[PDB]
Amino acid sequence: NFGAFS
Amino acid sequence: NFGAFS
Amino acid sequence: NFGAFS
Amino acid sequence: NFGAFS
Amino acid sequence: NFGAFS
Amino acid sequence: NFGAFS
Amino acid sequence: NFGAFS
Amino acid sequence: NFGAFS
Amino acid sequence: NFGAFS
Amino acid sequence: NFGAFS
Amino acid sequence: NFGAFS
Amino acid sequence: NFGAFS
Amino acid sequence: NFGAFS
Amino acid sequence: NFGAFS
Amino acid sequence: NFGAFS
């Protein structure tokens, strides 16, 4: 799972 | 799962 | 799953 | 699990 | 199984 | 199974 | 598990 | 199993 | 099992 | 099992 | 050469 | 060469 | 060469 | 060469 | 060469 600016 | 500016 | 500006 | 600015 | 930006 | 930007 | 600015 | 930015 | 930025 | 930035 | 959101 | 969000 | 969020 | 958040 | 948050 990857979140950036989210 | 990938989210950027989302 | 991929979301950008969404 | 990876979160940056999220 | 391989996922990149997904 | 292969997913990129998906 | 990895969190930065999150 | 391989995940990068995912 | 291999995870990077994931 | 291998995890980096994950 | 591959560019996405770049 | 690979660039994403870069 | 690989750049992500860079 | 690999850069992430860099 | 590897840079993360650097």
Could you characterize the architecture of this molecule?
15 copies of one chain form a homo-oligomer. Chain A is mainly β and 6 residues long. Chain A has one strand at 2-4. Helices cover 0% and strands 50% of the residues of chain A. Chain A is elongated and about 15 Å long. Chain A is built from no helices and 1 strand. Chain A binds chain B through residues 1-6, and chain B through 1-6. Chains A, B, C, D, E, F, G, H, I, J, K, L, M, N, O: It is found in: Nucleus; Cytoplasm; Cytoplasm, Stress granule; Mitochondrion. Chains A, B, C, D, E, F, G, H, I, J, K, L, M, N, O: It comes from Homo sapiens. Chains A, B, C, D, E, F, G, H, I, J, K, L, M, N, O: This is TAR DNA-binding protein 43.
Which sequence of SSEs, written as H and E, runs from N to C of chain A? Answer: E
Structural Rg of chain A: 5 Å
> How many H/I helical runs of chain A?
0
| Structure class of chain A | mainly beta
PDB class: protein fibril
Keywords: Amyloid, larks, TDP-43, protein fibril
Assembly: pentadecameric
Entry title: Crystal structure of the segment, NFGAFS, from the low complexity domain of TDP-43, residues 312-317
Keywords:
homo-oligomer of 15 chains; 6 residues
Provide the fold topology.
The structure is a homo-oligomer of 15 chains of 6-residue chains.
Chain A: E1 2-4
Protein name (chains A, B, C, D, E, F, G, H, I, J, K, L, M, N, O): TAR DNA-binding protein 43
Subcellular location (chains A, B, C, D, E, F, G, H, I, J, K, L, M, N, O): Nucleus; Cytoplasm; Cytoplasm, Stress granule; Mitochondrion
